């Protein structure tokens, strides 16, 4: 197993471990270069595609996957996430060992890259053969192989860029950076796009601010121009951007919440300090997990309805009508798009709110149990550091953590779900999922910045 795959592990390229720690300014520069490369690849279409007119059942796995259909980033960050969860499950099921020796973790990284590349090849083959990019029989072996090679090398670039970020050149991981970059790109596009669409009422810009300026300059600077620019229905609004800024501000405010535990040291005396237990204890993992669950359920419902239509169970799981849920569990798990949608079906809005809050709370608690951030898992860190709580005994470190951390995780789940629901209700551009992910990732970057400043 490990012995026979180690020579297969070493073939893949690896990022050189930096000789000296990289400062924050040029860390930001390298992160900007990495996201620029990812964005440029997101715009270049694959070669050999005859038709991009298909179903694309994973349309909702695009904000959390940083995927753009038909381009070099067809798969987005799916190889990285798949390899990460595969390795975490393998380590937790004791087939392999991450270890602590540099050789052990180097082999772990090499095998993670190997499994990510295997997943990349598998996804590319599935995408090619299952009818996307055109008929695989019509494209031929040469075109199908060329598309598979393009997707393979694009995935190799994604893993290389993520490894570049993680080895110390960037500000985090490829997953968070690419997700936040896609969300911010979407919001800025819907704010400032020069794209124009004509529906019989002349030229009309697709970006909100550009449409505002165009209308104010053209239509006699009328109050009707401002009313349309703020309450436009066929294109992005100015009220949608105002609600996006408002949700940004509120999520920032609630991301700044923390429970500051006064901790001292019983090993190195004089190391008074603070342990911040954030209200958003699991930063955006509830969003990622909830979006993945809902989107996977959507894919399952679409697959069942397409093949096994008419069955009562399939209809209850979801009714579809491009597609969007119209009935069933998939509908009740779908955000109400407009205020009129909320008004016509209050029951759907209530069920969506309850499901979002409960799922976010459940995923937050499950993640603090899984990822090693449980109260017991933090009490182990307190014990094997000499750290105790200032006004509490050393034998009571776990009980205070048991009081704080589970409640912090659950209520962070509720707060995050409520923020996403509020953003979805207000019509915020970027959506609740996108806005929350973007704010949490930029806050991770900001907290890395303040950590580096404190180290100075």
């Amino acid at each position: 197993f490990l012995e026979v795959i180690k020579p297969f592990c070493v073939i893949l390229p690896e990022i050189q471990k930096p000789e000296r720690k990289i400062q924050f300014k040029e860390k930001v520069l390298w992160t900007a270069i990495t996201l620029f490369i990812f964005l440029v690849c997101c715009q270049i279409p694959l070669f050999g595609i005859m038709s991009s007119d298909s179903a694309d059942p994973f349309y909702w796995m695009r904000v959390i996957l940083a995927s753009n259909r038909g381009t070099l980033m067809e798969l987005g960050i799916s190889p990285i996430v798949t390899s990460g969860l595969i390795m975490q499950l393998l380590a937790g099921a004791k087939i392999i060992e991450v270890g602590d020796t540099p050789k052990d973790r180097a082999l772990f990284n090499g095998a993670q890259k190997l499994f990510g590349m295997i997943i990349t090849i598998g996804q590319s083959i599935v995408y090619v053969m299952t009818g996307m990019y055109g008929d695989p029989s019509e494209m031929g072996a040469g075109i199908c192989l060329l598309i598979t090679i393009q997707l393979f090398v694009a995935g190799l670039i994604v893993l290389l860029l993520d490894e570049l970020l993680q080895k110390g050149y960037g500000l985090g991981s490829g997953i968070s950076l690419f997700i936040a970059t896609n969300i911010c790109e979407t919001i800025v596009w819907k704010a400032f796009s020069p794209t124009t669409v004509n529906t019989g009422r002349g030229m009309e810009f697709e970006g909100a601010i550009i449409a505002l300026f165009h209308l104010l300059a053209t239509r006699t600077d009328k109050v009707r121009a401002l009313r349309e620019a703020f309450y436009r229905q066929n294109l992005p609004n100015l009220m949608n951007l105002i609600a996006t800024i408002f949700v940004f501000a509120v999520v920032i405010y609630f991301q700044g919440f923390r429970y500051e535990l006064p901790i001292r040291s019983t090993k190195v005396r004089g190391q008074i300090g603070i342990y911040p237990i954030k209200l958003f204890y699991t930063s955006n993992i509830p969003i990622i997990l909830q979006s993945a669950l809902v989107s996977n359920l959507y894919v399952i419902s679409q697959m069942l309805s397409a093949r096994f239509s008419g069955n009562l169970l399939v209809s209850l799981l979801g009714t579809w009508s491009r597609a969007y849920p119209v009935g069933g569990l998939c509908y009740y798990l779908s955000p109400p798009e407009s205020f009129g949608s909320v008004l016509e079906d209050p029951v759907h809005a209530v069920v969506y709110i309850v499901f979002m809050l409960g799922s976010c709370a459940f995923f937050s608690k499950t993640w603090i149990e899984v990822s090693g951030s449980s109260p017991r898992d933090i009490a182990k860190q307190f014990k094997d550091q000499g750290m105790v709580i200032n006004g509490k005994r050393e034998t009571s470190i776990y009980r205070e953590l048991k009081k704080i951390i589970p409640t912090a995780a659950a209520f962070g789940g509720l707060c995050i779900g409520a923020l996403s629901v509020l953003a979805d209700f207000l019509g915020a551009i970027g959506s609740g999922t996108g806005i929350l992910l973007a704010v949490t990732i930029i806050y991770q970057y900001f907290e890395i910045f303040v950590k580096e400043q404190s180290e100075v």
Binding site: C42, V188, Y253
Partner: protein, 61 residues
């Protein structure tokens, strides 16, 4: 009967929120400025990449 666990959770959440350290007027400005800068960077780099590549995609495809 889950009324008692729900009330206990609500009470614990209220206590934890009251004991949390909320951002001040200066912390909020600092975090908001940092978020705005990071947004502007990522979003505008992506916007300009897409805007540049639209003519390129027209030319090559």
């Amino acid at each position: 009967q889950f009324v008692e666990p729900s009330r206990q959770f609500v009470k614990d959440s209220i206590r934890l929120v009251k004991r949390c350290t909320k951002p001040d007027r200066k912390e909020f400005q600092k975090i908001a400025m940092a978020t705005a800068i990071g947004f502007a960077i990522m979003g505008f780099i992506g916007f300009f990449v897409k805007l540049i590549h639209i003519p390129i995609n027209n030319i090559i495809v």
